[PDB]
Amino acid sequence: TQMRFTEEDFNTFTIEGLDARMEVLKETVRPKLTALGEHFAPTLSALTGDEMFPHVAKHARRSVNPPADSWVAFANSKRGYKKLPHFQIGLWESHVFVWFAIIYESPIKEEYGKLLEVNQETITKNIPDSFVWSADHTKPGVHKQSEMDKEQLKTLFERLQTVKKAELLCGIQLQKEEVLNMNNQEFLQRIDDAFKQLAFLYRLTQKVTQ
């Protein structure tokens, strides 16, 4: 099946109202998120060495506010993903994102933070300058690695262990124009390649999570 997002998928996030937007989202975006979940779960399991399970994002059951983005997450749990380091594939009306994430809900984000600060040279070395970072998955903004200061990436790890609502996300962005002009396989390959680059970040946390 086709998993690459088309124009009607990005445009779904412009529909006004929770009810109206949700009716379209369950028709355009969600089916593709679920397909992406079944497709990439085996891959991440093979890549990380841990059993990975897909989790399509919920909206109406969690918030009364219309979602500006949706995604499918992958974690080493069959019931959830928010409390563990995970991966994500999603989109806003402007772009598609692929993340390795540690969000506020993670009860042990303080340890991950101290561990990332100790491997800062290795992380900088293995994460391409074309990648991006984020301290909050609910805001579309990101920080480009190419224009990331050494102190900036360090403070980002520090705030992860200092500020309770600070997060850590690393991945890539595929602009709407790019996604609309590439084919399915090229789309799957961009995501697949990003997971290969992001895999070592999961392994670092793998150790601290016992």
Curated annotation (Swiss-Prot):
Q: Name one Pfam family in it.
A: DUF1054
Question: In this UniProt entry, which cysteines form S-S bonds?
Answer: none
User: Which range is the signal sequence, renumbered to this chain?
Assistant: none
Report the transmembrane regions from the record: none
HAMAP family from the xrefs?
A: UPF0637
State the family named in the UniProt similarity comment for this chain: Belongs to the UPF0637 family.
What name does UniProt use for this protein?
A: UPF0637 protein YktB
Q: Which organism is it from?
A: Bacillus subtilis (strain 168)
